[PDB]
Write a protein that binds this ligand. Structure first.
Ligand SMILES: O=c1[nH]c(=O)c2nc(O)[nH]c2[nH]1
Ligand SMILES: O=c1[nH]c(=O)c2nc(O)[nH]c2[nH]1
Ligand SMILES: O=c1[nH]c(=O)c2nc(O)[nH]c2[nH]1
Ligand SMILES: O=c1[nH]c(=O)c2nc(O)[nH]c2[nH]1
Ligand SMILES: [Cl-]
Ligand SMILES: [Cl-]
Ligand SMILES: [Cl-]
Ligand SMILES: [Cl-]
Ligand code: NA
Ligand code: NA
Ligand code: NA
Ligand code: NA
Lengths: 295, 295, 295, 295
């Protein structure tokens, strides 16, 4: 036998950083969870008990903290690029660094209508993430995403005209609930290295904001023919608004809310136009995916 | 042997309800998870296989839906009181109904600075809950709460002057991070029945808002001597602002953020006044509780 | 206002301990999660910022480790009693210690039909727990439990003869699936102190084993009239087999498995006597409870 | 823009099936969670609101139940192959079906030393899984796995000789705890279709058993130089014992257990050879991966 692929590192590294403005007293906090996995000429650690090729995962952890101390942690695309570049430059035999960052929300509190200088709220479990793959000789590949954005619309979703055969029981509808947890990813053009990533830094926060805004507005305003049709509209708009993105991918569950027929009880009418009370279904769920690129 | 206590019912009943304003087109959604457990002259179901005394848990589920269809589901204190009253009135042999409701957030979306008529976001996993105990001949006992309100302040928390002995390693501090998940409960005066609950309906949303506002403002503004001292201030203010509450209870974890000494690496200074990068600790956690009443 | 109740301490303290037999080489591992909350003359920490009365929660954590180092961690009833006694004896002003222990399974592996001296498997998420309340002047109150014991029987469960009215849709059945997650608690006679707890040490593991065995055998063998009737049989047997228990409490979800009518598809018969494929329901669930004592 | 990739279907479909032997009375249960995602000439559902190409996800759900009713659900490699083949054969325009199955444990209970005919226990959260990709014109690709197999050894793990530089603080060790959650995958040779899968049916359960046995024995017996070295030994043995496997992949967290220095308290010795009480660390964790193939 032989090693065909290998990577190793430290996962689930929780990191907080604070910035304190001396002049104003305003503090700003950042919290993330980081994973770094390395690849390179490491196969002998597996095949021959050769630990000399292993940068210890404990040392990878230390390096995450040190890097956070000495560099910006925002935008996460930048932090991940700095961190991954460090490993492939520092260690001759390490040839790729795969950096995943989950950013947690700490939104500044408003108290009596004024932003508070040092108090924050987790206003959502929605995350902003990056996957940064730094590959020696092949630049930096970045996938940015938002996930855990949970939404519901109570009308202006439809689903009719689907295939009907002997496996089909679903009734056509022209008015249903639609609820999902949005997972949206935008894949950047390959960057040649850290200098190029740094040259585009403002685009990272701007493109996250665009993706989020397009997602919410399109969800809210599209009289949806299907999850498929609505998500495609989101992707096409994001591509039209950032030329440095190559593809946009959505993965959307259809979190079903079922009508409840109560007519067996005193003729109570709770279906169709009279539907008021529904049963949210925990499982199963539709799962709809697509990757959209440029024509 | 003999039955000393018994209760039974249906848990984890997910319920959605929509209201549609015909004139304006504005829709409003409510989602909760409901548990109803009944007590009464039911011991023979346990001791003699006497199912005649059992209102089936499936029927309890049906009744939750029917009640939601025919009554307001908001405020949850009211819905729970209506629901619990139903069981003790409908069934001679059922003498108590214990209703727990967890309310999930569906906050109306703003799109282009305008509230959208039928689109919503789960803007937090924070919950609003009630426990409503309807006991035949003994009125209605209501505990209202908020939970899962996750906050962090980056300074203006202290902890010094605690007991120091041979088990103590903790260093005194005059400047630390404080983060918690707030669980706050206000216990209402006993209500004589449904009429009295209904007579106080506006106070339920108003008192939830007061509790939340006091919690956030006190957290943000108190230069905290301890979790103990800060939570007491919250409780005393809530009692002062709603005379129909008898007690306020807080349960607060101290979700620790530890400094990271990096001085072993090139003399990097990251402790005390120089602390920027911290290690959030998943466990263990302090857990601080108190119940405050009127003197 | 005034403090009506208060307790505080450290939660979620993970603890592992190993025993190494020098002669045989056999190692044995224990892992638990511990919570200790203290009560006493501590109100001024809440009302006056008086930290002098606070045994720091960090120190409580240290004390858990130290106590585990110097004493047996098994049975958990004993460890919790030692730990709680320490706090009320060491600190004049601390008058109660509430110790919760969750014990995690590390079952010795068999390799090639032989017990391995130092390798273990988590063979279940089933837990063994204790709640030990040590109250100065009032002895030691112990509740022992097993939880997370997940079982299913595919027949020999029935449910008929329940109340039927205008809220009832459930069909009577003489053959259904029954599945639950067992949470069973046995409450010991008050012990006067540590000496008395120690005098009964062998009874703790023996009574846990009895409770588990009775639960499994009764579940498997009872042609169940209801969850109520079956759980009562379990409780009565446990009381009959340990005189030092005062009560036994069960809390059992009825984790429903629904038939699926497939007759709309080519007349396929999958209900009643022909039921083969079922839909496990995540929610809602029946929840059935009782506390049984001696007549 | 244009669709570059798309798939859709139903996730989180819970399925139970019972087999009842009429002669013996012995019943046997199977429970799984199924996901089916389809690909094909479906792009117009995304780009033109063309639902005519959509086999409804509700219909996919129905089809899972129907298929389970009319075919074996074990081994999961077979069920997934039957299910995926159905979709690509039934629907001209569907060209791939991706079937994921998670199998849940229901192990027959022993009562008084005898296997019970219809009572079962969830004896572990360990799962057995398959990913079956049925691609029209390109056969059936199967990845089998076990996951959630949680183990610990208390000695006979080492880690020394790793790279040491200015980022390194980790001390070399010749005796540490090693604990992990095993995720192991074996990738089968491409099968030409259902007939070929069926021809190898006994190999599926046999190879799962081999993988599990090799994992446990190697974990228990290897005086481990690193997670890397130990996992490689497991993979090489599995490849040597099933020629129809092409690769074996492991993904192993290193779930750290840290020593606790207690020497600050009365000189208590709890490190090195005296280490008895440890602090299990929830995060971060090492994460070690490799894919092994034939030389
Ligand atoms: O938007 C939807 N897309 C689908 O593919 C689908 N299939 C259903 O059964 N419902 C659905 N709703
Ligand atoms: O606010 C705090 N209260 C406490 O009781 C405590 N104990 C610590 O170790 N830290 C603490 N911080
Ligand atoms: O064992 C059962 N006990 C109950 O109280 C019950 N109620 C149902 O609807 N099903 C039930 N099954
Ligand atoms: O088995 C191990 N492999 C590693 O790569 C590693 N790195 C550490 O810091 N510890 C480790 N233990
Ligand atoms: Cl769907
Ligand atoms: Cl604390
Ligand atoms: Cl039930
Ligand atoms: Cl590691
Ligand atoms: Na390199
Ligand atoms: Na009554
Ligand atoms: Na005392
Ligand atoms: Na096809």
């Amino acid at each position: 036998s032989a090693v065909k692929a290998a990577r190793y590192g430290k996962d689930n590294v929780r990191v907080y950083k604070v910035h304190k403005d001396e002049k104003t007293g305003v503090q700003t906090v950042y919290e993330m969870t980081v994973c770094v996995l390395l690849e390179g000429e490491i196969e002998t650690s597996y095949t021959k008990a050769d630990n000399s090729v292993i940068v210890a995962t404990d040392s990878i952890k230390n390096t995450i903290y040190i890097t956070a101390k000495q560099n910006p942690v925002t935008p996460p695309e930048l932090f991940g690029s700095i961190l991954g570049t460090h490993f492939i430059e520092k260690y001759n035999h390490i040839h790729a660094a795969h950096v995943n960052i989950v950013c947690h929300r700490w939104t500044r509190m408003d108290i009596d209508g004024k932003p508070h200088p040092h108090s924050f709220i987790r206003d959502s479990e929605e995350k902003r993430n990056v996957q940064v793959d730094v590959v020696e000789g092949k630049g930096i590949d970045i996938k940015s995403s938002l996930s855990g954005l949970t939404v519901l619309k109570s009308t202006n979703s439809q689903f009719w005209g689907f295939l009907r055969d002997e496996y089909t029981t679903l009734k056509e509808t022209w008015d249903r609930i639609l609820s999902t947890d949005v997972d949206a990813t935008w894949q950047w053009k390959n960057f040649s290295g850290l200098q190029e990533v740094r040259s585009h830094v403002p685009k990272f926060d701007a493109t996250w904001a665009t993706a989020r805004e397009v997602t919410l507005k399109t969800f809210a305003e599209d009289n949806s023919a299907s999850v498929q049709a609505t998500m495609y509209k989101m992707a096409e708009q994001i591509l039209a608004r950032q030329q440095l993105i190559e593809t946009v991918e959505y993965s959307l569950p259809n979190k079903h809310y079922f009508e409840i027929d109560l007519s067996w009880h005193k003729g109570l009418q709770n279906t169709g136009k009279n539907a008021e009370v529904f049963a949210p279904q925990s499982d199963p769920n539709g799962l709809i995916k697509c990757t959209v690129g440029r024509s």
